[PDB]
């Protein structure tokens, strides 16, 4: 019975919206929400820090198409949780942060962990609101959900006072709500679709720029049909990896700088001309390059660089339009244009310049030598998580993707500390696929304690640490008087993160010699549980 | 060879197609107003930043390009927040240009130092400080794009004093271009057909017209749709004129019955916010089905679940539906029970009100006074309205024939927009008369702008319905008024007409209903601003 | 009964805190609060704009020593009201803004005038909070009051939802609260008091800087005893006027620039080294000037200019300490030092440079000629309100003050639009004293409609408008095509604001000839009600 409590109703509302997992760290006043989630069919993962819980929620949202959810305690719980709200806002990922709030009737008294939580969360959110009654919990979870996954996805925050979590409400008084339907689709006008193909027809050096917005739209099939039909070369953002297969002959990634610099028409597909693509401006682009832009957010059209043809709407639906329109066209990009020859030639020279490093078996291993074994060992159906600077940037050029939404990295915000949260999100989003987490030694220190979480929930994430002893290469040894003589970027060289995984009950392997890398990787993969292979890296 | 900051921001406003600039000058923005005049941007100096920012917002709606206001440091911005909020709420495009104190005085307590981006941000789609002269064009372009693309809204630009006075070589200025008209998105073919399918099966279909369709400038497409389908319609106050009010398919005179009984409502650029009572019982059938046409995806299903979503531009999507209606024989028959019920109820409601329309006893009531206003309204007028009873009754009795020709308190229900919005109407199209219908309380928020009307020769015709308060007041001011005067009460018959006379316009005071039309005609004939002050019944 | 409604309890709580007047503009949902105020002994003034209501509240707080209160409607009411919060924050004046809020159970639905009101008001406030229940209304009004008048005074905001205003509560369930006592006083350590007198002893050119913080502290008597005992010259901020009598022989105001430039010790008494005193820095000050600073706010000590001796605490209590300590000292500033001779000599030259303008009877009048008649006509016990640029800045040098807290002007924020709000606050704070409002023609246009309020409440404010046809001097006539040819600063020259006062039922007088100014002033003063004398001003 006849009555529902606040904790039960918010958990029930998460399930109603199709949210199957909940990340958090319990304590006053939200422990009952986690308990209620488990009884309402929502799996709960108790993390070691709200940072990881909120970052996992954000990535889980991207992977599932419904909002990710995290639940955090009053005060410092929300402050820690802001990390995830910012990351979801920046990446255009859907999430709900549920923040506990102190008793409503203690306002102004200095209650335990009293904080202006809607105020401090609002800058990161599409929608942020306090829940004033049990009866309207379903309304607020529905509204948060809609604002998270409609349009440009983003972050949302809900404040749940302690006396609301513990309050109760008759069933006939609960607000009516419904599962938020899959987002409505908008498509381009016919003339815009034709104008896009017209511009491509005239291009001497066309280039497609693939971003994770197309992965979020789940239009990889439409994109693949388009690229195959038009035979236009493509480049890709790090998490746009896999929308097209990296090992496709039309990939210009190995000649990326030349491609952007010389293209006369770029086709943005769910990608922004922000820092990742160097703003679409010289010296990285031709000053007169013309832009075809496909984005769901109207305000992004013409950002930084004017757009010639705007395709505002859903990536999958609009790419379907272009494929249908290509039936009535003879045009395709010839296989032997100077454009294709130039990109092929430069790609080969760049790969040749790097080959000596790939084949260098001298120890300690460099990035390219270590990643040679990782690349050969990657399962084709793996979800790849990557975090770091050199380890991440080189790792994602050397590890090819074949499926979309199968790369998770530092993202638009360049955040360190998302690593194991995003790995854990990948692992619970699809337990049938292996999850590889490639990390630098600095990155793993932000969230390393989540290794305990990996063992606790039997999540067999395979971690590979490339260890050069710092944020970038460190020093050969720790000097005396380190507070003044140790480089700010330096960490213990060869710090035994493998022994940390062992400590909690996983498989840790320490590798100093390149010849032993692949054996460690195979052993880590065979272990039925989480593993960490700690590879000593050259500092040169 | 060199451009100064004041000149470059004025030049950038012109580049973006912004032809007027409202403001109140003073440190440090006077040079921006002067530069606007030299760059082809007309400047109107107002008497308060409230009116300037409200005018900017309405000007944006009327022109399709952002309205612009310029205000001084500190309190200038705080006053200007009023307009940012109103533009945010109405989904209207504007740029507020706020002067900022010297960058090198940060933290010292400079004259009118304030955290202006901080305090303006909650109201804005985009808010940013301009750090250099060279990137002025970049920021004005970005503000413009964010103001008029998608759901339109407010934007704020901070201009430090040393930037306004700074200079930059031409070869170093940021490149920028006029922001093109917003790109259009349309509905998938199946959604268009699903919309017509739902209307076909409806026993009691109803179209809800909002000002988003007016902003989209799709009145022609809407008119073709209503005529083809013969579906009745209701309208928001500023949605007035998208369809002509005097159309046989208007259900406005039976609005409560229509909303309560419809089984399919078609939202056209209208929200199920307070204006349409959230789409919920007791004002709607609990099982009503919704067709929703809106440019903002997040609005789809707000408060009430949507059956068919048409996300994109109103004009473009209504064109789709009209083309698709060629492949259908269906239209709503003229003699359905629905049409008969609405016709019957409309007639009973009009009959209930007629005794008040025809009551010639003085002092006049709302309906008697508005009888003369309605007969006197020019067909091509832009109507500005502000108040409570004066506004709500005025907009039911004064029929609109053109879109974007009604300006009222809007989504935010703001008092103080009156003369700002009237002035925006007057400079947006000087070839059309502008009527401002106001209550006596409303005119007190912005009344000093009458001086602005005379100064710029703007012939706004003001009609004040004067009942002596926020709603009816008292017959006289009692003794010890701080304790005995009702909080809502104002001087009954306060001579706002003599205020217009004071500044050089035509003021006429009318206490007898038989003299109302003569005063209106005389006000209209005067070649300048006018105010007819009509004593209203307090019962 | 037995039960109290929200409107009644907040009005009752205002009275409990000693707030005797309430300014506002009624409408949904706060009309009941204004009605309740009148029955609880709190006078209500219904204004024509929330700007004036909030500005009046702020000045009323300064004048009364208890917080001023304003009540505004939902949404735009609060947005308009922010003007007053900012002005109270900037001037260090106590006020409570009571903002109506939409129904709690309509959150997120788009209710009539729904707004994030605590969010948008917080930047201006020492304390801002929503009132969640009727029972705790007294608590929140007490807490707002304490934060408004303790320490550095400032602005506070209280959010009152519609369903709280209309809600009710049993008397036994109402929160207990008490009248906030007069602020506790802090004083300086004995060594600091002696160090201050030591520094003054050694000074060759000492100068006292009097600010309105001393007026707020109501320590004018202690200051007057100190100046008379030490015979140290003084300057004064515009609203610091009257702490010392302006016509005192130790006033250096007529040589203000020289005084600040040459002083070797400045004694800040409730004054900031912000823009009003030119930051205490060269070229306006000696580079090596030493500072004695008396302020209640510790963070202000050493702001912009290092402080030699800090006197942190209440101005009245600390000045009492210095007077007691001066009993054990022989030192005083000699009457014939080069310092005194230099200031006397420069003052005389500055007054002589201006005399031709004071005596210029040619029409139209200039500032100094018009203010000659105003000065002779000012009642000695008047409260002077001033607003404008030239009209205000010249007016306050020519119109001498004899009492503290008897000048109200644009203040720290330099705000236009405070004029009639502050005049009205003066008029209801002490009906036994005349109130003069000196205004430029631009300033009166910000709040001019409040003339109706003056007639409605029989407030006999005497307005004097110096009319030069713009923000500063305008043009002789309005040109053709004014949107392009009228100077941005220009207004109708000689706009008949006198006829606006006549319109509403006051006494308006238009003066073009200087010889008629005093007759108009006398006639305005004799009229038993509000008056406006509109004086045509030279544009040169
Ligand atoms: C929250 C946060 N803190 C710090 C950084 C700065 N940062 C840091 C600390 C990185 C670590 C790089 O070191 P690594 O060991 O992970 O990888 P490599 O040594 O192979 O470059 S990459 C990077 O941008 C960041 N982006 N985000
Ligand atoms: C900024 C602000 N202040 C106050 C209000 C409240 N308000 C006020 C003060 C109105 C005035 C209505 O009185 P009127 O004389 O304009 O018209 P009627 O007397 O004919 O109702 S209508 C209304 O909503 C508001 N909406 N916005
Ligand atoms: C809210 C606001 N808007 C604008 C200004 C700028 N401003 C304005 C508009 C002033 C008016 C000066 O003109 P006046 O007629 O009051 O006086 P004078 O003509 O005698 O200088 S003084 C001043 O600083 C301001 N300070 N505050
Ligand atoms: N369904 C969708 N269809 C098209 N564009 C979308 C869709 N969802 C999101 N987007 C857009 O995709 C873009 C993703 O940009 P970004 O995060 O910079 O990608 P990347 O880092 O891979 O370059 C955003 O501008 C976002 O608005
Ligand atoms: N070009 C457009 N096409 C369709 N809808 C639009 C367009 N521009 C804005 N809108 C939408 O129109 C709606 C206007 O709603 P609202 O202001 O509530 O109208 P009203 O007050 O007249 O009912 C908003 O939801 C806005 O997103
Ligand atoms: N009771 C008090 N005793 C001493 N200083 C006070 C007291 N109340 C306020 N103050 C301080 O007085 C100062 C007033 O400064 P300000 O407003 O700049 O004055 P003015 O404009 O007259 O120069 C502030 O720093 C404030 O903290
Ligand atoms: Mg490293
Ligand atoms: Mg009225
Ligand atoms: Mg002037």
Topology:
This is part of a larger assembly, with three copies of chain A.
Chain A lengths: L2 E3 H11 L4 E4 L6 H9 L3 E4 L3 H15 L3 E5 L3 H16 L3 E7 L15 H5 L3 E6 L6 H13 L5 E7 H4 L2 E3 L19 H13 L3 E5 L1 H6 L2 H11 L3 E3 L19 H7 L2 E5 L20 E6 L13 E4 L2 H11 L12 H21 L8 H11 L5 E5 L2 H9 L8 E2 L10 H11 L5 E6 H7 L2 H7 L5 E6 L14 H4 L11 H8 L2 E5 L5 H10 L4 E6 L4
Parallel strand pairs in A: 2-3, 2-4, 4-5, 5-7, 6-7, 9-10, 9-11, 11-12, 12-13, 14-15, 14-16, 16-17, 17-19, 18-19
Antiparallel strand pairs in A: 1-8
One copy of the ligand Cc1ncc(Cn2c(C)c(CCOP(=O)(O)OP(=O)(O)O)sc2=O)c(N)n1 sits at the interface of chains B and C.
Summed up:
Chain A is built from 21 helices and 19 strands. Chain A is α/β, with parallel strands linked by helices and 540 residues long.
């Amino acid at each position: 019975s006849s009555e529902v409590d606040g904790a039960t109703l918010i958990a029930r509302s998460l399930k109603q919206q199709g949210i199957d997992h909940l990340f958090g760290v319990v304590g006053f006043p939200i422990t009952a929400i986690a308990a209620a989630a488990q009884k309402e069919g929502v799996a709960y993962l108790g993390m070691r820090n709200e940072q990881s819980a909120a970052y996992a929620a954000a990535a889980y949202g991207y992977l599932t198409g419904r909002p990710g959810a995290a639940v955090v305690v009053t005060g410092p719980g929300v402050v820690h949780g802001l990390s995830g709200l910012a990351n979801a806002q920046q990446n255009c990922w859907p999430m709900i942060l549920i923040g506990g709030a102190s008793e409503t009737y203690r306002g102004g008294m200095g209650a335990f962990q009293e904080e202006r939580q809607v105020l401090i969360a609002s800058p990161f959110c599409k929608f942020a609101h306090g829940i004033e009654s049990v009866a309207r919990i379903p309304f607020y979870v529905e509204m948060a959900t809609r604002n998270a996954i409609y349009g440009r996805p983003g972050a949302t925050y809900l404040d749940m006072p302690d006396d609301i979590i513990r309050g109760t409400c008759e069933t006939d008084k609960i607000a009516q709500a419904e599962r938020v339907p899959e987002a409505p689709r908008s498509v381009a006008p016919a003339e815009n679709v034709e104008a896009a193909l017209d511009l491509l027809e005239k291009a001497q050096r066309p280039l497609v720029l693939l971003g994770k917005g197309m992965a979020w739209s789940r239009g990889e099939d439409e994109v693949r049909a388009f690229i195959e039909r038009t035979q236009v070369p493509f480049v890709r953002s790090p998490m746009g990896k896999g929308v097209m297969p990296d090992d496709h002959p039309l990939s210009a990634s190995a000649a990326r700088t030349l491609a952007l610099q010389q293209a006369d028409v770029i086709f943005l597909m769910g990608a922004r001309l922000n820092w990742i693509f160097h703003f679409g401006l010289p010296p990285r682009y031709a000053k007169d390059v013309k832009v075809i832009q496909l984005d769901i957010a109207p305000e992004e059209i013409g950002h930084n660089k004017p757009t010639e043809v705007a395709l505002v709407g859903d990536g999958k639906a609009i790419m379907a339009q272009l494929n249908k329109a290509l039936v009535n066209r003879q045009w395709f990009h010839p296989k032997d244009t100077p454009w294709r020859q130039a990109l092929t030639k430069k790609a080969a020279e760049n790969v040749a310049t790097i080959k000596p490093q790939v084949d260098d078996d001298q120890g300690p291993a460099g990035y390219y030598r270590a990643l040679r074994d990782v690349a050969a060992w990657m399962p084709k159906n793996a979800i790849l998580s990557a975090e770091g600077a050199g380890t991440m940037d080189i790792g994602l050029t050397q590890l090819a993707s074949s499926n979309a939404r199968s790369v998770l990295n530092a993202g638009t915000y360049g955040t360190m500390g998302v690593g194991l949260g995003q790995a854990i999100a990948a692992a619970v989003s699809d337990p049938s696929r292996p999850v590889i987490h490639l990390s630098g030694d600095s990155a793993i220190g932000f969230s390393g304690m989540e290794m305990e979480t990996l063992v606790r929930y039997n999540l067999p994430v395979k971690i590979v640490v490339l260890n050069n002893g710092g944020i970038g290469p460190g020093m050969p040894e720790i000097p005396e008087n380190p507070m003044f003589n140790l480089k700010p970027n330096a960490l213990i060289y060869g710090a035994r993160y493998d022994k940390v995984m062992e400590a909690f009950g996983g498989k840790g392997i320490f590798v100093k010699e390149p010849k032993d890398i692949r054996k460690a990787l195979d052993e880590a993969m065979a272990f039925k549980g989480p593993a960490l292979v700690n590879v000593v890296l050259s500092q040169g």
